[PDB]
Short mmCIF file of C-alpha atoms in Angstrom, two decimals:
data_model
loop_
_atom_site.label_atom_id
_atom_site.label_comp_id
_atom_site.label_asym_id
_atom_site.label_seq_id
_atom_site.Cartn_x
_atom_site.Cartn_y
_atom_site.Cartn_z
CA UNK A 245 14.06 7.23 35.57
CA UNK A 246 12.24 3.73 35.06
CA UNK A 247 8.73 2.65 34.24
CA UNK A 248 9.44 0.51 36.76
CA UNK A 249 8.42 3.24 39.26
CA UNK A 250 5.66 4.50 37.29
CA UNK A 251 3.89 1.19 38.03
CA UNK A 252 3.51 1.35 41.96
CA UNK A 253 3.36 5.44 41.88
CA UNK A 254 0.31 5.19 39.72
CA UNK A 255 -0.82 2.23 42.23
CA UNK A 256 -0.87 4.58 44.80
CA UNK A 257 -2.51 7.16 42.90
CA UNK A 258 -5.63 4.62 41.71
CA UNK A 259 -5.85 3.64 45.97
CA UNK A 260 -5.92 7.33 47.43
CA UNK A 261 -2.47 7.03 48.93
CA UNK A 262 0.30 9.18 48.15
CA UNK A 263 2.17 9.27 45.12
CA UNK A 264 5.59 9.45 44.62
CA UNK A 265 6.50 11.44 41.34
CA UNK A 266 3.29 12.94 41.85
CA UNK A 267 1.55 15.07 44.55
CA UNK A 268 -1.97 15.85 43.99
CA UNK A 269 -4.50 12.76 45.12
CA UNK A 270 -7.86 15.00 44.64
CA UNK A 271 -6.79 17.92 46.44
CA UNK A 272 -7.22 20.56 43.70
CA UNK A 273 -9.01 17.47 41.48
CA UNK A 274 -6.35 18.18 38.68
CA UNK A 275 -3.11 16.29 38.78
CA UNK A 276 0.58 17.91 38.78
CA UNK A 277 2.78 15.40 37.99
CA UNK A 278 6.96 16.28 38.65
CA UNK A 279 9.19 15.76 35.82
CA UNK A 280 11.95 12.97 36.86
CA UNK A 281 12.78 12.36 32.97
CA UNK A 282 11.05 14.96 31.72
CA UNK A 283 8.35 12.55 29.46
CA UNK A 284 5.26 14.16 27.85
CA UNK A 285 4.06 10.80 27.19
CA UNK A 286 5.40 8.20 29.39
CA UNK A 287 5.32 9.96 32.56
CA UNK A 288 2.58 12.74 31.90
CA UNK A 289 0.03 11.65 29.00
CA UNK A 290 0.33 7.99 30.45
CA UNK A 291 -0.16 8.90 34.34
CA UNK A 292 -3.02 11.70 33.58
CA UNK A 293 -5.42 8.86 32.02
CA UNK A 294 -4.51 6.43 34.52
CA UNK A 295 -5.15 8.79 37.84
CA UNK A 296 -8.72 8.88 36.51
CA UNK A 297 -9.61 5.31 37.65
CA UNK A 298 -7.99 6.66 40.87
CA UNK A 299 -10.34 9.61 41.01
CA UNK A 300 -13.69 7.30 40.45
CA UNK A 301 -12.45 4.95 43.09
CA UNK A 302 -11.69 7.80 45.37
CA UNK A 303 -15.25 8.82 44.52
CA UNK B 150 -16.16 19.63 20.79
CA UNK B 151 -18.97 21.80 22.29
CA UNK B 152 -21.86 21.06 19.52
CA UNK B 153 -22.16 18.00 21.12
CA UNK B 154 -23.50 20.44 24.00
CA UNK B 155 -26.93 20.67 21.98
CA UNK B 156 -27.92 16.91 21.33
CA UNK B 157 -28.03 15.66 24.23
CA UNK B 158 -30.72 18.34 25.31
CA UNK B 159 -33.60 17.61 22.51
CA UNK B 160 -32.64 13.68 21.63
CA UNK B 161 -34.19 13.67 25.33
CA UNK B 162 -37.24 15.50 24.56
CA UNK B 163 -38.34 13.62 21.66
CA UNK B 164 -38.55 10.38 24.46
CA UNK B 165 -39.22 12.02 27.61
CA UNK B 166 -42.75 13.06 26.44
CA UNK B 167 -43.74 9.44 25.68
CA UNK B 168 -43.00 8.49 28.79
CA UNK B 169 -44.51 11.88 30.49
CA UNK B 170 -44.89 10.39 33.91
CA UNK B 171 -42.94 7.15 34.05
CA UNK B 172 -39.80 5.96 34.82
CA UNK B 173 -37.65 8.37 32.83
CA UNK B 174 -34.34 8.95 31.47
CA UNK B 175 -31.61 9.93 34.13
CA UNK B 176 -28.13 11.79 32.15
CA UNK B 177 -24.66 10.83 32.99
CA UNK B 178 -22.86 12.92 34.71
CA UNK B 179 -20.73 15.88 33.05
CA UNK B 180 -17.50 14.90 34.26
CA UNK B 181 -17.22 12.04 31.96
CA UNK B 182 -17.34 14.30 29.58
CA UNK B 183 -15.26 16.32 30.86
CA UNK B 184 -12.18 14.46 30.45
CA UNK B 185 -10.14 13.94 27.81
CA UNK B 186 -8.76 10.43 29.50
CA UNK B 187 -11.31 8.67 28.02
CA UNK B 188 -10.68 9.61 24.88
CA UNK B 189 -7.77 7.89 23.25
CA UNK B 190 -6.70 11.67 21.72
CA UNK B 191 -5.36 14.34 24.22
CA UNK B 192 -5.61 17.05 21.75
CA UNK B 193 -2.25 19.20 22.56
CA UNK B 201 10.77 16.76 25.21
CA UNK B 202 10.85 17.73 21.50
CA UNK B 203 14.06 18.00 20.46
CA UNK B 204 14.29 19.22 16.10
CA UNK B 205 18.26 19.19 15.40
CA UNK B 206 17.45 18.12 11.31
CA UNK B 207 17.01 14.13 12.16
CA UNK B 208 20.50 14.00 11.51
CA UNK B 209 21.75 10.69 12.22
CA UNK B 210 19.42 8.46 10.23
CA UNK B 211 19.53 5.18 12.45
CA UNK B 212 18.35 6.91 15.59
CA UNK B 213 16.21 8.16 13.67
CA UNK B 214 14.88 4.69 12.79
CA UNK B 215 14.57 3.99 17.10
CA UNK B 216 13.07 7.51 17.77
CA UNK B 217 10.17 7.91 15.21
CA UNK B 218 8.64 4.20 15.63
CA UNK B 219 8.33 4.89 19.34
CA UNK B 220 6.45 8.35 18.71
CA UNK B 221 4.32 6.64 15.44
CA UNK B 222 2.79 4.00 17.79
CA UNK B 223 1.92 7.17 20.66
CA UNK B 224 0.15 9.00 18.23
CA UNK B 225 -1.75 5.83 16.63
CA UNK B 226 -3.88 5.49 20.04
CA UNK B 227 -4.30 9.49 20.02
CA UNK B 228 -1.34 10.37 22.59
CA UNK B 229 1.29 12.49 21.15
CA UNK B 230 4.67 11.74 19.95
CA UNK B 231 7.73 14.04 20.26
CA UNK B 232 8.64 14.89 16.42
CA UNK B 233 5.12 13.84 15.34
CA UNK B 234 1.96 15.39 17.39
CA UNK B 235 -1.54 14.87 17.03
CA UNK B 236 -3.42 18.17 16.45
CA UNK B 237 -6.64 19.14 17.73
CA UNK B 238 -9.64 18.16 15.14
CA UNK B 239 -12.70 16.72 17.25
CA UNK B 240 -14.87 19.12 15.51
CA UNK B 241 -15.29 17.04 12.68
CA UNK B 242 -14.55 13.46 12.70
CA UNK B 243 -10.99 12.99 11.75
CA UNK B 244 -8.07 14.03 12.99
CA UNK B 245 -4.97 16.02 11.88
CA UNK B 246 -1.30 14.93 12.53
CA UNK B 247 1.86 17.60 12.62
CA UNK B 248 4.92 16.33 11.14
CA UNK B 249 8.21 17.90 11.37
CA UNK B 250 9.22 19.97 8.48
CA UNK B 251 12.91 19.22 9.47
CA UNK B 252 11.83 15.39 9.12
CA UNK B 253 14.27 13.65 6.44
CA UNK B 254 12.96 13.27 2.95
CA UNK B 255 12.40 9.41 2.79
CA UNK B 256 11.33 9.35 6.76
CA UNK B 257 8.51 11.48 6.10
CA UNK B 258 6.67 10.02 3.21
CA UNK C 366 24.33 -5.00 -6.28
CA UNK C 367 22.70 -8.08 -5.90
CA UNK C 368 21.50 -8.60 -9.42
CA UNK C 369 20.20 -12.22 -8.52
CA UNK C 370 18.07 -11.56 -5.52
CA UNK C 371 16.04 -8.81 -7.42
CA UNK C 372 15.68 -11.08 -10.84
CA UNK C 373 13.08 -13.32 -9.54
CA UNK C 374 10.49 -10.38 -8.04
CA UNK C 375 11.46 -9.37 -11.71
CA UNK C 376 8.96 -11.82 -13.14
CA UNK C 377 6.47 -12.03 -10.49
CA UNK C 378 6.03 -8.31 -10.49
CA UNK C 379 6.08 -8.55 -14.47
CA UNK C 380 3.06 -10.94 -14.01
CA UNK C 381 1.47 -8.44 -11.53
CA UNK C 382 1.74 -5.26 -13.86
CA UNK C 383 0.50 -7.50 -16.21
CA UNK C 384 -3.27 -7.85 -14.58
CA UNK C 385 -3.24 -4.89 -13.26
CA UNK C 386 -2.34 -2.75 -16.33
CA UNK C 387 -4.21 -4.82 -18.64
CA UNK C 388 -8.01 -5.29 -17.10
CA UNK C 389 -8.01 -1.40 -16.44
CA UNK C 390 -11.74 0.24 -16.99
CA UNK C 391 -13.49 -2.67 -16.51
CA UNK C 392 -15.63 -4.46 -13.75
CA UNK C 393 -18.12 -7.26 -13.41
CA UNK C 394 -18.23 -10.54 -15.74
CA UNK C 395 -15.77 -7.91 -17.78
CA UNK C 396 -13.64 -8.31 -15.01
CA UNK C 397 -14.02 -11.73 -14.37
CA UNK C 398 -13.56 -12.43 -17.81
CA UNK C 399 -10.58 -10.31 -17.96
CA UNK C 400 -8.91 -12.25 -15.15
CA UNK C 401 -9.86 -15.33 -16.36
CA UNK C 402 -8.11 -14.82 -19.79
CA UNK C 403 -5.46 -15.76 -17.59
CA UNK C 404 -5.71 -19.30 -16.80
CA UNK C 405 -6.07 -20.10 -20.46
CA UNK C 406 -2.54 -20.55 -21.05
CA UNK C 407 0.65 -22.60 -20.62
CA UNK C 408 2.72 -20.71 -18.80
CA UNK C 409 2.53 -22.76 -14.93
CA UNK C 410 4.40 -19.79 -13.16
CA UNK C 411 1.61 -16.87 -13.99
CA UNK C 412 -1.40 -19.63 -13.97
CA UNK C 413 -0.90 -20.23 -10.23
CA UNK C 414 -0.20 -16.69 -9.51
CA UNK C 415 -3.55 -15.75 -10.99
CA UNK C 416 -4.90 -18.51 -9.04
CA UNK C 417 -4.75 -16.43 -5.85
CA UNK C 418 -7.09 -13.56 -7.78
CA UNK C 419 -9.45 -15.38 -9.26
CA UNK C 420 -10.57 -17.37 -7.05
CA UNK C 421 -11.49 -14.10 -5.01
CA UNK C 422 -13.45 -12.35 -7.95
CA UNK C 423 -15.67 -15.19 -8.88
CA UNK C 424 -17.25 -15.35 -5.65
CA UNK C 425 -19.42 -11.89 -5.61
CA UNK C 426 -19.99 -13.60 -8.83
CA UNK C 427 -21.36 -16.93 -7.94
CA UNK C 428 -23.08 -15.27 -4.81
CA UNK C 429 -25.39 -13.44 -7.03
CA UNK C 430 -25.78 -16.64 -9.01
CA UNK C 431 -27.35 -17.96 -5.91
CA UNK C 432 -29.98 -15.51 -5.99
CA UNK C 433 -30.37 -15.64 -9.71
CA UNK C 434 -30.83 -19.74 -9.95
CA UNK C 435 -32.84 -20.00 -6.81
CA UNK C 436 -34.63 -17.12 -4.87
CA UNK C 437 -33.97 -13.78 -4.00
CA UNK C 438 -32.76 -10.70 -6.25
CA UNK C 439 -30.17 -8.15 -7.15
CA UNK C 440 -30.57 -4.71 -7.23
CA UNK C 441 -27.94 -1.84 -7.01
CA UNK C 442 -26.53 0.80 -9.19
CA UNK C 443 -24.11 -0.92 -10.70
CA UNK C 444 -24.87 -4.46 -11.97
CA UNK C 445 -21.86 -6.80 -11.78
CA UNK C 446 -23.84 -9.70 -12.89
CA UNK C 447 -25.78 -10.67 -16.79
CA UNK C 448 -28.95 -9.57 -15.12
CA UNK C 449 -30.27 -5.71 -16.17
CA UNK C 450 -33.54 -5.94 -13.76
CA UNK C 451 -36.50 -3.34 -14.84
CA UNK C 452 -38.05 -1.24 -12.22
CA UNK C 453 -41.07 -0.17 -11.96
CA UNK C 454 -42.76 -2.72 -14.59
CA UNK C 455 -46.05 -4.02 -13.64
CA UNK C 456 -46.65 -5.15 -17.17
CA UNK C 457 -46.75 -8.67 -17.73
CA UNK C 458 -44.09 -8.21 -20.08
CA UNK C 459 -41.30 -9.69 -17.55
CA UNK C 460 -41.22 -12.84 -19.16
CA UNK C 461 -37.76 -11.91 -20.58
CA UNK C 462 -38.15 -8.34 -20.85
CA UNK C 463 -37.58 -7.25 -17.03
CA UNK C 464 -34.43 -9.77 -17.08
CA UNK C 465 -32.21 -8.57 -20.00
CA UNK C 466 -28.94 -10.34 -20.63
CA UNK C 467 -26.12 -7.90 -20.70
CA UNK C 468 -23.63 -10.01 -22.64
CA UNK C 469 -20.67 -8.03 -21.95
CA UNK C 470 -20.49 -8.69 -18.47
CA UNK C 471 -20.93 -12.78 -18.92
CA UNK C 472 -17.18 -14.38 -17.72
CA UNK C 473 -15.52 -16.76 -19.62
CA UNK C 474 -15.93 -20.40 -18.08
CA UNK C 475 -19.97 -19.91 -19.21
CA UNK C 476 -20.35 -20.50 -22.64
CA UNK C 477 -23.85 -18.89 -24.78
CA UNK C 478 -25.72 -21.82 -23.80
CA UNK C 479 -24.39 -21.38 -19.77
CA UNK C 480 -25.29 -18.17 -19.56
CA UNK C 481 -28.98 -17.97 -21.15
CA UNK C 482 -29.95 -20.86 -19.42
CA UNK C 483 -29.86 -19.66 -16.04
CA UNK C 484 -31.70 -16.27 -16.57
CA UNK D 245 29.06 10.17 -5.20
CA UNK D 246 29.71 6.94 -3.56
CA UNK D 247 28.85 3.59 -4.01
CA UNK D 248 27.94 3.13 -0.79
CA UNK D 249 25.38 6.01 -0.29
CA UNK D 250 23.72 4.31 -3.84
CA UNK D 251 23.01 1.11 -2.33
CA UNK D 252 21.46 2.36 1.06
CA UNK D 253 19.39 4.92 -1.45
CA UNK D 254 18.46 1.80 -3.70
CA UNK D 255 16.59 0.32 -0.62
CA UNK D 256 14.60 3.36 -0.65
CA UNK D 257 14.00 3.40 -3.80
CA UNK D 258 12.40 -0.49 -3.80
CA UNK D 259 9.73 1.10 -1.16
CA UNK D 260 8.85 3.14 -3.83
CA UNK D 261 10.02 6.86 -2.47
CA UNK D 262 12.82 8.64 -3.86
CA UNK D 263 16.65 8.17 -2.40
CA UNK D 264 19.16 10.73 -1.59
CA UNK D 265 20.63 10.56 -4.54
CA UNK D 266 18.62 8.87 -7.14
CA UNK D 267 15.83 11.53 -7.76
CA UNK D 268 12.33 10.97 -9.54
CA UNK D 269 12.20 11.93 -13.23
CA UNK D 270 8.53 13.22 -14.17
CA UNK D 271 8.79 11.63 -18.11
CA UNK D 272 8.22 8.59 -16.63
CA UNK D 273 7.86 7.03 -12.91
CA UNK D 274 11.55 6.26 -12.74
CA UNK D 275 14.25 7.12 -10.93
CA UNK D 276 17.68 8.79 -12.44
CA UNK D 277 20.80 8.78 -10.50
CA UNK D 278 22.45 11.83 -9.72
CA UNK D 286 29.32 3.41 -16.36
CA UNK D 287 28.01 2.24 -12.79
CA UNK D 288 24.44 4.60 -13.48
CA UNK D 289 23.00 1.94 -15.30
CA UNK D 290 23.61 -0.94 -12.99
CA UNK D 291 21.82 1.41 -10.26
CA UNK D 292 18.74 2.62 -13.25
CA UNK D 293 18.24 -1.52 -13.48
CA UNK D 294 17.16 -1.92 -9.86
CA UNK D 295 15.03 1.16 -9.50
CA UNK D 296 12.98 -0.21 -11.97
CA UNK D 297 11.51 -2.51 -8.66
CA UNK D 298 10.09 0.90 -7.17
CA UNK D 299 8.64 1.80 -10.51
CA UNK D 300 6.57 -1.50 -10.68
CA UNK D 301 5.91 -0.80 -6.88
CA UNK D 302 3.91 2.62 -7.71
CA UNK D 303 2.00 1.29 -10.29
CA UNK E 150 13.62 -4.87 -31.90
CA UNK E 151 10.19 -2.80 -33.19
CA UNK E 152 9.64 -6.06 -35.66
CA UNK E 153 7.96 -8.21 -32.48
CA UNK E 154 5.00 -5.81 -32.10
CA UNK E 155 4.19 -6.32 -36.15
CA UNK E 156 4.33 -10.22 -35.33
CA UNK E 157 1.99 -9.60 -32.30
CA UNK E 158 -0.35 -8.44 -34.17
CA UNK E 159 -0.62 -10.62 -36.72
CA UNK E 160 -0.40 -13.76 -34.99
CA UNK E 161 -3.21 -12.33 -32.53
CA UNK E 162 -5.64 -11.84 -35.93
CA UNK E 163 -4.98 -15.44 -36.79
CA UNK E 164 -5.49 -16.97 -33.28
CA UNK E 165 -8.81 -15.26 -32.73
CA UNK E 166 -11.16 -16.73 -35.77
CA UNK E 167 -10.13 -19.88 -35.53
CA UNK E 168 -11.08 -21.11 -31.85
CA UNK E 169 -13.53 -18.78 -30.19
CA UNK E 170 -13.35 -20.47 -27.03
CA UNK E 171 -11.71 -17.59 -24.90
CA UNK E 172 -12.98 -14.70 -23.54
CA UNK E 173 -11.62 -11.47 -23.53
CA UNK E 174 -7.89 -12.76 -25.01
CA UNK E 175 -5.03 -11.11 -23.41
CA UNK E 176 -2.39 -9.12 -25.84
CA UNK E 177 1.19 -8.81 -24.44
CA UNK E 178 2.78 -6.14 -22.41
CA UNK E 179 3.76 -2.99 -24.03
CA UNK E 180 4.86 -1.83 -20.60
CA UNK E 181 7.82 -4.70 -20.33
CA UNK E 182 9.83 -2.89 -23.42
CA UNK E 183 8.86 0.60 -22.23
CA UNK E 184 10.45 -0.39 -18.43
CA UNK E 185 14.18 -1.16 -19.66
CA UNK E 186 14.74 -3.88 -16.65
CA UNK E 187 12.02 -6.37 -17.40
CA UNK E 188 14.40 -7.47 -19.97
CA UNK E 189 17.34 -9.29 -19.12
CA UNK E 190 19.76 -6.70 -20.68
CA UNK E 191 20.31 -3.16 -21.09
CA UNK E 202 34.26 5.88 -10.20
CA UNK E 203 37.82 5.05 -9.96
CA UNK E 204 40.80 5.58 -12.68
CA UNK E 205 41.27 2.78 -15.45
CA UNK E 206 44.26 3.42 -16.56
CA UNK E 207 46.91 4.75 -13.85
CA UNK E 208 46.70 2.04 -11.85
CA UNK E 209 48.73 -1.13 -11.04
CA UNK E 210 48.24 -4.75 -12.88
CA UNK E 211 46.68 -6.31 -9.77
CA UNK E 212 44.45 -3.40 -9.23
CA UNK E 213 43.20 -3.70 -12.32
CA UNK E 214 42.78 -7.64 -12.79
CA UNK E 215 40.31 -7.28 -9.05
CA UNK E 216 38.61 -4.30 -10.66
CA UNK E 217 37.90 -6.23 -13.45
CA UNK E 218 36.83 -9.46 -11.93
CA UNK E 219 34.17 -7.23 -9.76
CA UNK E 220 33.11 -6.00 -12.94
CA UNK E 221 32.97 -9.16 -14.85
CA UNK E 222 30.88 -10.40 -11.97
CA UNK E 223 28.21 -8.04 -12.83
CA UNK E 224 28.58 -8.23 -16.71
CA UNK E 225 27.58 -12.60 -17.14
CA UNK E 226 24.00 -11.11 -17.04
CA UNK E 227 23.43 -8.85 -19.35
CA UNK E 228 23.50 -4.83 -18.18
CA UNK E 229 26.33 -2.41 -18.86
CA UNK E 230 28.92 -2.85 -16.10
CA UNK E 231 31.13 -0.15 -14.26
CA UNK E 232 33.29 0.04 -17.29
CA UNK E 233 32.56 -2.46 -20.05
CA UNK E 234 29.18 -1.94 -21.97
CA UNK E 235 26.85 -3.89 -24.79
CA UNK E 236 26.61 -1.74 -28.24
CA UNK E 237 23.44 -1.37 -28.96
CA UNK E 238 20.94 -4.46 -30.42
CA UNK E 239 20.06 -3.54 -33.53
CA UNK E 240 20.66 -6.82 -35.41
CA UNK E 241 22.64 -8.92 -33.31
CA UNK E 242 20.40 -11.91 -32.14
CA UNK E 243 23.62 -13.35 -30.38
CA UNK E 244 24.87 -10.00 -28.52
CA UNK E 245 28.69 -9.67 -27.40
CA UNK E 246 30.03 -7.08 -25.31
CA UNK E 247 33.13 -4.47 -25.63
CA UNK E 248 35.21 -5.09 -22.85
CA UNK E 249 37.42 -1.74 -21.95
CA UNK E 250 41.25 -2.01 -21.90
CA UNK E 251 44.29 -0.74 -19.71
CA UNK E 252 44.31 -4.60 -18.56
CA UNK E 253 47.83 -6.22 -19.65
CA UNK E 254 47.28 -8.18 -23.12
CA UNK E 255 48.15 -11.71 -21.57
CA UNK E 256 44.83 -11.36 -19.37
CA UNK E 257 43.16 -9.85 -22.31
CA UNK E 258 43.33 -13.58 -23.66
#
């Protein structure tokens, strides 16, 4: 896919809104993210430290 | 790693009795410390055909060098888990071409 | 091949082996009189390129010449400087004998009469 | 061997790590290709002056 | 050749004792005659091939050989006494280019 995306999913995932390659927004407090170009560091390692800011803001 | 379990009991101690009634210490909470995001390591596709074609090699390993210089992982290189002690450990391929590797 | 572009980092890294290979095993005024042994010649190609490493030696150098010609003191393990300071003398025997002179680590734009005069 | 594969190993060799082809020698620091030998021995002698 | 170390020396003994003005005198690299490039001087079929052939293989090696190191095919004999070295340029070149 594109980074391009990355930037408003992970927008969504600081506000408490739903994702869009990625479904959990504190509802089992870890975060599942759905391989789309199958990244381990541009669309998992990258997304799982920036949902935390999500997760104190939801808190 | 988990050591770091027992400091942050008795470090207290040492300071909370010289206060012994005023306004003491709070901790921070656990879950801070929980995470690994916000650390730059993350402690733990990959795709080893030999590095065959040397100037792809050249665009690949760059990319994956500057992910593991902040602590995330690379493809061919990973970062491997040393927070006991304070360094770290890198894996390299051992199907990484000769001059690539040093 | 390219003979020609490799030629002239032929001489520069000449010069550079040359410092480096030469002023092994030694430190202090030893070292700054190993470095300057360099500027006293004719060649204007290596004088200038030692010109970029001795200007950074000398000043550890002239920093504890600050506080060797005016207040303050040096003490550490390993005595880049002329002075040999004597602990643990309460003596008045100090009046050159707490400040010895090591001579060999003196560096070569102070003379005998440079160097004794400011101890 | 080529050439070719000697000049692309000679750039490795100025880094100061050993080429494809042109292999360390353990008598000295220098590097010993695997006539035109000589031309290659005379620009290795860059990486030699690199390690020390 | 070995001679210039001799010289070295004994030029070194005369400069020191009569200024004592430097420090710590440098002596000159041993390492530049060790190291055979600090100095300035040290495939395909010769013989079976055509006359223009072998005037642009030589001109490619000729190009290498006005600086001193052995070319592709033409080398230096060695220095021994020759203060004004000359080269042995290889045959199978016609003898009117040879001039």
């Amino acid at each position: 896919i594109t980074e391009a995306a990355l930037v408003r999913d992970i927008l969504y995932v600081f506000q408490g809104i739903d994702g869009k390659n990625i479904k959990m927004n504190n509802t089992e407090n870890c975060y599942k993210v759905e391989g789309k170009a199958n990244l381990s560091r541009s669309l998992r390692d990258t997304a799982v430290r920036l949902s935390e800011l999500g997760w104190l803001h939801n808190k | 790693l988990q050591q770091s379990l027992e400091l942050k009991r008795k470090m207290l101690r040492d300071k909370q009795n010289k206060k012994n009634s005023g306004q003491h210490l709070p901790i921070f909470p656990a879950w801070v410390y929980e995470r690994p995001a916000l650390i730059g390591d993350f402690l733990i596709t990959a795709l080893p055909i030999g590095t065959l074609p040397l100037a792809s090699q050249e665009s690949a390993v760059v990319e994956d060098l500057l992910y593991v210089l902040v602590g995330v992982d690379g493809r061919y290189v990973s970062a491997q888990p040393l927070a006991g002690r304070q360094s770290r450990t890198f894996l390299v391929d051992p199907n990484l071409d000769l001059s690539i590797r040093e | 091949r390219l003979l020609v572009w490799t030629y002239d980092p032929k001489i520069r890294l000449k010069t550079l082996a040359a410092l480096v290979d030469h002023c092994q095993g030694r430190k202090g005024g030893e070292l700054a009189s190993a470095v300057h042994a360099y500027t006293k010649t004719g060649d204007p190609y290596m004088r200038s390129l030692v010109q970029h490493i001795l200007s950074l030696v000398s000043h550890p150098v002239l920093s504890f010449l600050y506080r060797w010609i005016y207040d303050g003191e040096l003490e550490d393990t390993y005595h880049e400087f002329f002075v040999a300071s004597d602990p643990t003398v309460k003596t008045d025997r100090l009046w050159h004998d707490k400040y010895t002179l090591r001579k060999s680590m003196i560096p070569s734009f102070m003379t005998m009469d440079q160097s004794r005069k400011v101890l």
